[PDB]
Amino acid sequence: IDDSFTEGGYISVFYQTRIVVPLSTPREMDILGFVSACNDFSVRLLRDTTHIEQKA
Amino acid sequence: DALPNTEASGPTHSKEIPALTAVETGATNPLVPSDTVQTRHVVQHRSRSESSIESFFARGACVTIMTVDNPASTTNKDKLFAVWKITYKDTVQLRRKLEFFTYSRFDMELTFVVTANFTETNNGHALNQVYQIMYVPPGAPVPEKWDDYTWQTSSNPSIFYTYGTAPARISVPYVGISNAYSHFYDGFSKVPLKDQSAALGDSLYGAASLNDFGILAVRVVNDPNPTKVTSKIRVYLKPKHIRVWCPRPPRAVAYYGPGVDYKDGTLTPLSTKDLTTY
Amino acid sequence: DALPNTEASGPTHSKEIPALTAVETGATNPLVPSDTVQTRHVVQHRSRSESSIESFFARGACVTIMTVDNPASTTNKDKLFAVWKITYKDTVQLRRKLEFFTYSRFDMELTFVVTANFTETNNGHALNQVYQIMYVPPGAPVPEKWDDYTWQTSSNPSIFYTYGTAPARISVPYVGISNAYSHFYDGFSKVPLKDQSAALGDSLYGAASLNDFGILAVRVVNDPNPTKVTSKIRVYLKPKHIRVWCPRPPRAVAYYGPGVDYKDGTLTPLSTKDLTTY
Amino acid sequence: QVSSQTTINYYRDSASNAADRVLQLTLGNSTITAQEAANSVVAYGRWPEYLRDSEANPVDQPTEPEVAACRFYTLDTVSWTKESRGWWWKLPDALRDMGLFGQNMYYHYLGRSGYTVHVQCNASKFHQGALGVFAVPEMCLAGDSNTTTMHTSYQNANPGEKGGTFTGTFTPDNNQTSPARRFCPVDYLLGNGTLLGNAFVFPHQIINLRTNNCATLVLPYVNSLSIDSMVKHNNWGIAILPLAPLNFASESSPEIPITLTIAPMCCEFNGLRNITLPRLQ
Amino acid sequence: QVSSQTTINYYRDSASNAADRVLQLTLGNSTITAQEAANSVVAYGRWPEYLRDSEANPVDQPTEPEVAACRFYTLDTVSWTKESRGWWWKLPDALRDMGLFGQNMYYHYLGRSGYTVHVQCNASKFHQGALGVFAVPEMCLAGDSNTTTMHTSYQNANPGEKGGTFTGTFTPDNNQTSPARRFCPVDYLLGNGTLLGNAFVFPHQIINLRTNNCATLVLPYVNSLSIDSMVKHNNWGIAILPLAPLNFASESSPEIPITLTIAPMCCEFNGLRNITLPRLQ
Amino acid sequence: LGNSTITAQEAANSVVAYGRWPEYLRDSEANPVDQPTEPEVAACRFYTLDTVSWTKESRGWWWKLPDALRDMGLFGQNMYYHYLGRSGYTVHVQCNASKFHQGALGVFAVPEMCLAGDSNTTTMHTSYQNANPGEKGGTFTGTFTPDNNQTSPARRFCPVDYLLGNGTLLGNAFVFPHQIINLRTNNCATLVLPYVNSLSIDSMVKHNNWGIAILPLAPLNFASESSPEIPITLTIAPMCCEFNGLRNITLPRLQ
């Protein structure tokens, strides 16, 4: 749960050196993210999820 | 199990460049924290036991609510026995947990929790009731009256629950005709042949008798009192010895019926958030 | 364990002077009765077993009282299900016993004792009720109606207690995210940064999510009767396998809320007694 | 039995117990080459295999076409214009009018088969885009009518080799007299109702025009049944969705074609009889 | 298992089971001497130690300043007039603007450290008094408002090196418009609400001007967590209370100064990033 | 290095200046006695100094070390607090251009890099503030221009680009440890600079051991365009940095 004490931190992406494209080339790139767990990950204390609601 | 120990690491100057990969292939990067950061040795105690399939499913979940009444003999209205077709698609939570995966072999454990209550303003007396819970496999006759021959349970297994005692419970093995329960089925049960009437061969999409488990009929054995007494049996289903195959992405929008359909206005799961905002 | 035997002693004339010490250091005097008095041999039978940490905490203590009613369907007022945030700081006795020490790892054993009673002057009839006690960890949806989806307990553990049977009971391991429960926390959950709005970063002193254990929701499963029936679940908490660290001085003045605050007029614990008066 | 942290079983029944760029592959008389293909995905790490008698339900001697059916058939080509949302082909329904494989699957009652799908799409160094090819097992899709469920027809749910398309926005089939009974899968929901982002759980590859121009997927035979009817049940399903839109030299009308080449592997059949002549149009 | 006065475990989960004067000490480039210091207290009999990997939560390589931060910093001096009730400094909040230790704790996210506190106060043979120095772990203090709980602000609860003071009598913060959100710990209650007499359970020493003029406390790192944020959580807390009031030659205005010298020991840090710039005034 | 990682897919190897990797002070050649404070991870990190545009009509830049890393993280704090300090460096110069760009930089790690003054009426008259720009660095001027102001001399460096400032010639400047960033071949240059000094350990606030000078050997050009710009970045990582002599913190006058 979004919690003040057990915060995770922050992640950001910046330009170190700008994207340089030659002429007759598209001038608007796109980057796609991906998030996964590493081999040391783990969870516990099963609970219910708020993403699904049986309306009425 | 003790997860892998986080081994130590230090400054490096090599050219292996494990950090950079190519996602074009279908293999995820096995990179670990020691590779891209100076890491200190750490003895690992955490274990993934709680997250296994059994521990993830080792909890009964309500799958239906069956209403059965015992109308007063004063009122001519007939008794209401509940016939519920066996399925886990009446609710969402168990359905959503199961629909992570495509196939599943799991023994089942059903628990029936019964409750009762008077309805007429007259605070009358009703002696302790006995409920019959009979399983009618696919084909066996469906009871049509609360006091017809079909309730003899000559071959249909049945439970007699005396209201006020510990909730009823029974286990069942894997009863699938196939080699695994088919949570999803892309196909039909009939193929519309080119040389027959259109009506013939018309079957609902993704509907097959793989999930054909018969019905469950619940009645109040007691003959009617002078005061109506309603009751509601709740069925809690626990998968035991569960094995699952072919994972899938969890449902994001609210369910709509047995299929994979979604309603018109439900197609907005995500929430507003500016791109550059922590 | 057999406490140390009180060894014999006799007249002495030495210069060790063990009686005199200096309290300035932080070490208490290990002096024993044999040193300052002529003592006779005594075989020791007394043992400190009853005073160990387990025996000191091996007793359940009430930690809350949750009121849940089943209002008559005649009255349109909705049912009252009780949501109680898990904590041992609602009462004093268990809180005071625990706040001897600063940190504690203890498995828990919760016992629910339910009672019921009619409220309307009409001496009506209410069939035996079934109570659902569902644990909602931190984050899981909080039920808002007594008959909404969240009660399916698909993943939230839940107990169904049939009123009139033996009180419900369940054990739980150590669930602290840290390595020991923090009875006291000197700090905050946010640090007010010099370059942001004052409201942001403002958090209650000594408040952290270390004691964030979710809520406990109790409801009456039975649909409403014609007569209102109130009930009060009492939760008794027993610490098992308890280990404690960093003792402290027991509270002297009456508690005031979750923190270590004390009210204005409560600062007079001691009692009158003349200096020279037996 | 004293297990570590007394387990005694009292009930006879068990249910009562407690809890890389270069590639060239030849199938039959067909050969496929690709100099910039980023390796292959053996979906679920299982190569297609012939049915093993240890798990054999039917008794009839199986007819394995071998070379005559385990060939690479190139399905029609599709233009990846800028404003295109995706495509989906169900298998083996796609290979129903392809050579002798279609004849065998129509004649024989039961049939199993793995597949090798090669998705080919090549662009210049100056092109910009990326496709994602997912081999969805048991791929279901949502209907178009909110007044009915599971109402899609056989003809519309099995387009054949033409395939289907993903629609940008949902649109109910408001016609209550003669419902179209037609799939209306929203692109980002992937049709099933899930999210596209998670769709990577399925076996998948990405055709990133900067890096690779091909994607190979070796799909085994996954099904609750060892062998099942091929005319009813479509085991797998290929979904190609453009993760990043096509772009080229600031030109607002860039098109490149995408081709599929599917090769049945270790395909076995049983139950020969009169030939199925289904109604499809 | 037949235990002495039949214990069978039926549930897999474990929770289901049944129930001396002379002293000279050198840290880095700093040295402390005291000819009449009455030995030292190793609080809880545990010397500070570097984090051991067997109980290491984070992975990042730890930055140990060693000599640059494990030095003796002398906090400001305070006059022990006759009518003074006590003082309290929270750690490591006191060493936040002290040399490189402050910089390291602000830069690094997580940080652990033990301390060596030397309290110095010297008086003539003709002076009369006695201090008690207690190293309260997790030292909380009561608020000033009876209308709210846990309402103290970060700025007021972390005075820094200036420290705080104990008030003789409680006084509610009656201002309901802009509450001061300020600690109001009563001297004899020790602030927490307990009694002063029992406060000797904490690690402690007594500076009795007749016998000794110094008090040394080696405080290990006690916390529910192996490593924790230093800007949020103040592990220890030093409370100096005069057990017996100062007196000298029948003089009604005797003052002597009390000084603190705190040396972090075995201080380790993790999680480097932009530097914390908190609001303190 | 520490919590910092640097990657470069087209970097043309590294130069270990003078073939000596930075090393901690060895007691066999240890002048002071005080126990040395080695920050290790907290100071041996990669700090990215500001970026500079390499327009067509730009003559060069120069950053003195460790004067550049004086307000960079804990390294600045350690060097200001401690009296004596030694350290090697790892300088990574990053500048990337398309296949259609045309140019070439030369990065020289000048030891004891001195620079000529601006006044012909006085010698060695430069001020501390002007001779230590910090991370902003300095620039080479195309043509010499005397500081004719005789009332309040600017006391400012005026190093001519081709003379390299010292008065020598640029062509010979390759005797120093150096690399070339040729945009056709490589876009990065790595230099591992050891600690060279007449003294085993010396004050870091007074003496600037090394000095990085980046001069464009061939001017930038692109598609016949007369205004091509690309940015150049520096990433410097102190290595095996040791300090001695702790005391009140130096608060120098710099502006």
Ligand SMILES: CCCCCCCCCCCCCCCC(=O)O
């Ligand atoms: C009512 C008393 C007797 C009941 C006998 C057992 C009832 C269940 C038998 C069929 C269960 C098979 C379906 C469950 C699993 C699923 O549908 O995924």
Ligand SMILES: CCCCCCCCCCCCCCCC(=O)O
């Ligand atoms: C209501 C039925 C299921 C209940 C499941 C167990 C409920 C307790 C789980 C959290 C307990 C952790 C907090 C107790 C110890 C403490 O706060 O000091």
